[PDB]
Ligand binder design. Sequence first.
Ligand SMILES: *[C@@H]1O[C@H](CO)[C@@H](O[C@@H]2O[C@H](CO)[C@@H](O)[C@H](O)[C@H]2NC(C)=O)[C@H](O)[C@H]1NC(C)=O
Ligand SMILES: *[C@@H]1O[C@H](CO)[C@@H](O)[C@H](O)[C@H]1NC(C)=O
Ligand SMILES: *[C@@H]1O[C@H](CO)[C@@H](O)[C@H](O)[C@H]1NC(C)=O
Ligand SMILES: *[C@@H]1O[C@H](CO)[C@@H](O)[C@H](O)[C@H]1NC(C)=O
Ligand SMILES: *[C@@H]1O[C@H](CO)[C@@H](O)[C@H](O)[C@H]1NC(C)=O
Ligand SMILES: *[C@@H]1O[C@H](CO)[C@@H](O)[C@H](O)[C@H]1NC(C)=O
Lengths: 230, 194, 37, 97
Amino acid sequence: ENQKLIANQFNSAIGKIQDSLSSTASALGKLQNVVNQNAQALNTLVKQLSSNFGAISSVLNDILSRLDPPEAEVQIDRLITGRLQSLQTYVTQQLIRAAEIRASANLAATKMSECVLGQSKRVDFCGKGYHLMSFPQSAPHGVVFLHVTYVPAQEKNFTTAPAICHDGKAHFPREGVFVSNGTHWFVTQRNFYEPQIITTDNTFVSGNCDVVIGIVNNTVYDPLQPELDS
Amino acid sequence: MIAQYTSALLAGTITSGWTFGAGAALQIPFAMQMAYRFNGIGVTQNVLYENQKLIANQFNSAIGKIQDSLSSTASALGKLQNVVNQNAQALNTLVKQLSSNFGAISSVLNDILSRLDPPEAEVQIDRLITGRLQSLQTYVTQQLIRAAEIRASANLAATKMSECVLGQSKRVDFCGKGYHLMSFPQSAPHGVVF
Amino acid sequence: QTSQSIIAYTMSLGAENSVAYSNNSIAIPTNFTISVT
Amino acid sequence: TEILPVSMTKTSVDCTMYICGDSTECSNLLLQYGSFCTQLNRALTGIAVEQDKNTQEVFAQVKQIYKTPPIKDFGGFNFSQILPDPSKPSKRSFIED
Ligand SMILES: *[C@@H]1O[C@H](CO)[C@@H](O[C@@H]2O[C@H](CO)[C@@H](O)[C@H](O)[C@H]2NC(C)=O)[C@H](O)[C@H]1NC(C)=O
Ligand SMILES: *[C@@H]1O[C@H](CO)[C@@H](O)[C@H](O)[C@H]1NC(C)=O
Ligand SMILES: *[C@@H]1O[C@H](CO)[C@@H](O)[C@H](O)[C@H]1NC(C)=O
Ligand SMILES: *[C@@H]1O[C@H](CO)[C@@H](O)[C@H](O)[C@H]1NC(C)=O
Ligand SMILES: *[C@@H]1O[C@H](CO)[C@@H](O)[C@H](O)[C@H]1NC(C)=O
Ligand SMILES: *[C@@H]1O[C@H](CO)[C@@H](O)[C@H](O)[C@H]1NC(C)=O
């Protein structure tokens, strides 16, 4: 019964995604961040081909053809120590960052499974709000999950009561909350406001009107009597 | 202010519970949301709504036992005091590596500069720089591995805030042994107590 | 911001909302936004 | 009671003072090592911004700041030592203290 509304909000939100990607600089902040992380990793790697590490230079040709061999062997040993520590540093931060990328990718596989291939009941796992369905986008060196979430918007206030005992039997909500606008008591699901009349279909009996505090009196109707009336 | 976020988390959990982690805070009595958190573990709400004094007293006695074990047992905060100690030993090893010469004449800069002219002071200071620089890379890479541990436990603490404080986790033994009802953040130093 | 200048203030942590808590107060959202996070 | 770590102590190192405290030529040779402390400090700064991210992903799970009402009829659940006490200047709670 709100299909046009959900469709139009989805379309407006994906349009806002377009606008944010076009306008906001770090709209791809995580993936542009990772691409830049790779770029600076490689660029530091290459600039370490301009670092001395104690050697005379870094372009091996001038080490070889600038000075005498007897200590050129030692100097090229120092240069290769520096380059090999640079490559080990690069590879171990590639391993740490690939553990980051593998946590991100196990999270993106878990997100594909529980967000795209299914619905995740984990709170804030597929975006803030109650996740509906994610959409993968094959973004560069990553994935963009269009986390279609349900975010409830227009709050209110009502009067509530833990149980509603009709004639000495405490009634409880099967799934939802007992609420009232001030004179009539309604049961509503916990995440969106439908005032529903109180009946044994959505209320069950356990106990009495004394063992529970906050319990108020209200009629819990029965559908058999009106049907039997005629 | 970390404790102010923690107090806001407690206030939202008591007053709203899970509904403040989706959007705005939706006020709800504490008995209501405790009953709903029983309902979320396959235990009916009537269990609390008829044993409310028992659940409240067991909760109070259990948190009293928590305070007693904290005041008495030294390793009550085993994980967080453990991590604080890992930070302390990491920094202290880093500092004492300034007392390590790594095979050089000395580990103090001024004596190295004064005793030797640059001809060999260059080699000695190179040894100090490479030793303390491997010390910095070693320290920083174990800070990266330990921050991957702290980020795994912080993504776990954010997942646990979301699914334990901001909601109820149906994952078995994710928010403690037994069927989770509700967690409470307590911003102990350099961490959180759930 | 204030013309507009640079201001150094204690961070608000957000608006100091006081939840209208009581043993009978309940809030339910009457509407929702489809948020494509 | 699960004691989860959230944030390491946020540490930033200046090699020109750490490796080369009150020494100038040491900083010159540290530069002669190319660029390790630029990326070392960027690693540590990523760690520190990561600690702030950790803290605000754990604790800043909500934009507002909610206050517990002075009347606390929480069905009987004593949160006195759980909720903060207005007596301590550096406000915490008894359990948190
Ligand atoms: C909630 O628990 C606190 C304990 O943390 C209670 O305060 C104690 O109450 C006892 C008995 O009244 C006193 O002997 C202690 O001196 C109190 N200690 C403190 C630190 O206040 C408090 O009364 C409890 N509140 C309720 C409503 O049960
Ligand atoms: C509902 O009414 C109470 C007064 O009983 C008030 O304090 C509260 O702010 C109202 N709800 C909202 C969302 O303002
Ligand atoms: C509460 O809702 C019922 C159901 O329509 C209505 O009859 C009644 O007038 C409402 N009362 C108030 C105070 O809004
Ligand atoms: C609810 O609170 C009000 C005021 O705080 C009090 O008068 C009333 O007796 C309480 N009712 C229950 C069931 O706790
Ligand atoms: C509900 O009704 C019973 C008897 O009809 C009475 O004893 C009790 O006080 C009532 N409770 C309320 C909250 O009106
Ligand atoms: C609910 O929110 C939408 C926008 O998200 C708005 O267009 C609509 O008027 C609101 N109310 C109803 C009853 O849909």
